[PDB]
Amino acid sequence: QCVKLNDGHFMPVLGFGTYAPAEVPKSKALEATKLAIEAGFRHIDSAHLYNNEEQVGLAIRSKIADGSVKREDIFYTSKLWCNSHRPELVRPALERSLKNLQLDYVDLYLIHFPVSVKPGEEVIPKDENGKILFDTVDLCATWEAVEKCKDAGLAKSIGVSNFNRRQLEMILNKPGLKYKPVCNQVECHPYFNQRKLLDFCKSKDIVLVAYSALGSHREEPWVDPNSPVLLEDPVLCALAKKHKRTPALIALRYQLQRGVVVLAKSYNEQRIRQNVQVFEFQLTSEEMKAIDGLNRNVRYLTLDIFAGPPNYPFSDEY
Numbered sequence: 001q002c003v004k005l006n007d008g009h010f011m012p013v014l015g016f017g018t019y020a021p022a023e024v025p026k027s028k029a030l031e032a033t034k035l036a037i038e039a040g041f042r043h044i045d046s047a048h049l050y051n052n053e054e055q056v057g058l059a060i061r062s063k064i065a066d067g068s069v070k071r072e073d074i075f076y077t078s079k080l081w082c083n084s085h086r087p088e089l090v091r092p093a094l095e096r097s098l099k100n101l102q103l104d105y106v107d108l109y110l111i112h113f114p115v116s117v118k119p120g121e122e123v124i125p126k127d128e129n130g131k132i133l134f135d136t137v138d139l140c141a142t143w144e145a146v147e148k149c150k151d152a153g154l155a156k157s158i159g160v161s162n163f164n165r166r167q168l169e170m171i172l173n174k175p176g177l178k179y180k181p182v183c184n185q186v187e188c189h190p191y192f193n194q195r196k197l198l199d200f201c202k203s204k205d206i207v208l209v210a211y212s213a214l215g216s217h218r219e220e221p222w223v224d225p226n227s228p229v230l231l232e233d234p235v236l237c238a239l240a241k242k243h244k245r246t247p248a249l250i251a252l253r254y255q256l257q258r259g260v261v262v263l264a265k266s267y268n269e270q271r272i273r274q275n276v277q278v279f280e281f282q283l284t285s286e287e288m289k290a291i292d293g294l295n296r297n298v299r300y301l302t303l304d305i306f307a308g309p310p311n312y313p314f315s316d317e318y
């Protein structure tokens with residue numbers, strides 16, 4: 001189930017998505033993650049932003065106490081939110097995520113999003129006129145404090161999320177660079193297959209990590225509800241009939257076959273169990289290219305509110 005990272009560590013190819021909109025009680029974060037560990041997920045993806053590291057952490061700690069796993073067997077990811085991009089604030093944010101988790105280390109720590117916001121207790125601080133209180137932080141600086149987190153052994157591996165190509169290049173080109181990003185976690189599914197970005201990532205030994213791989217939570221205002229529903233796709237449905245699987249499984253399996261590490265969120269016990277069956281069938285080259293034909297360039301997570309500053313990552317082609 002694993003891919004070797006460029007820092008020598010191993011990342012399982014299928015990960016469990018822990019985000020659910022806040023209308024869903026956080027108690028389900030805990031139940032769901034235990035079920036995911038139980039169903040066989042070994043890679044668990046969260047963030048400070050998701051406001052669930054207490055529950056996800058307990059979940060993980062719970063499955064260790066009952067003997068179902070040891071900590072060595074779990075790959076846990078957290079992410080540095082945008083109000084702690086200032087170097088001095090990077091270590092304390094990771095430490096805060098760990099105290100909440102009640103874990104000594106994270107397996108992977110990402111720069112969640114490349115646009116910095118004003119420090120403070122507000123998640124997305126805005127003025128009363130209109131806009132987000134953007135901050136001026138050198139990402140190359142932010143990264144260096146992220147590397148210090150690897151040196152301190154708080155994070156076993158480090159990487160980025162929602163970086164475009166120039167931003168990845170930027171880190172690669174940085175004088176003094178200690179560690180490459182192990183990964184770039186981005187939106188990827190058959191309506192936005194990220195081919196160019198995926199190729200660039202492979203040409204530089206960076207794991208692309210597909211999120212919203214099942215077509216997103218569709219939570220407003222983060223997703224246009226007029227957007228097409230990925231899992232209703234006729235071809236994904238056909239391939240599912242043909243393989244006696246589901247459109248979800250087709251869509252997950254697509255990513256495994258093109259060397260993409262794939263996340264799937266589910267709080268449903270059935271669909272949690274179903275999702276691990278990505279390791280029990282496979283697609284033909286002809287099928288896989290059928291799925292390449294589904295490319296719509298429909299980006300579910302535009303993150304428009306962050307547009308404006310130069311580091312808004314989706315202005316560039318890729």
Ligand SMILES: NC(=O)c1ccc[n+]([C@@H]2O[C@H](COP(=O)([O-])OP(=O)(O)OC[C@H]3O[C@@H](n4cnc5c(N)ncnc54)[C@H](OP(=O)(O)O)[C@@H]3O)[C@@H](O)[C@H]2O)c1
Pocket residue numbers: 016017018019020045046112161162185186211212213214215216217218231246248249263264265266267268271272274275301
């Ligand atoms: N910037 C970032 O780094 C970023 C951005 C977005 C997401 N993420 C990460 O990616 C994870 C997942 O992304 P996401 O939640 O946006 O979308 P997603 O996992 O692609 O889509 C999940 C949706 O599909 C449903 N589902 C799951 N399994 C299914 C199946 N077998 N059949 C039918 N439906 C199924 C889920 O519902 P049920 O729960 O009802 O089953 C949920 O509504 C998040 O938890 C987070 O960890 C990261």
Ligand SMILES: COc1ccc(Cl)cc1C(=O)NCCc1ccc(S(=O)(=O)NC(=O)NC2CCCCC2)cc1
Pocket residue numbers: 019047049050051112113123124217222301303
């Ligand atoms: C302004 O809001 C808040 C104010 C107060 C509190 Cl108490 C919580 C929030 C909050 O939590 N609001 C974000 C809600 C949210 C979380 C996860 C997802 S997600 O798409 O599943 N995962 C991601 O990382 N999404 C993106 C990536 C980076 C840019 C923005 C988040 C989608 C949306």
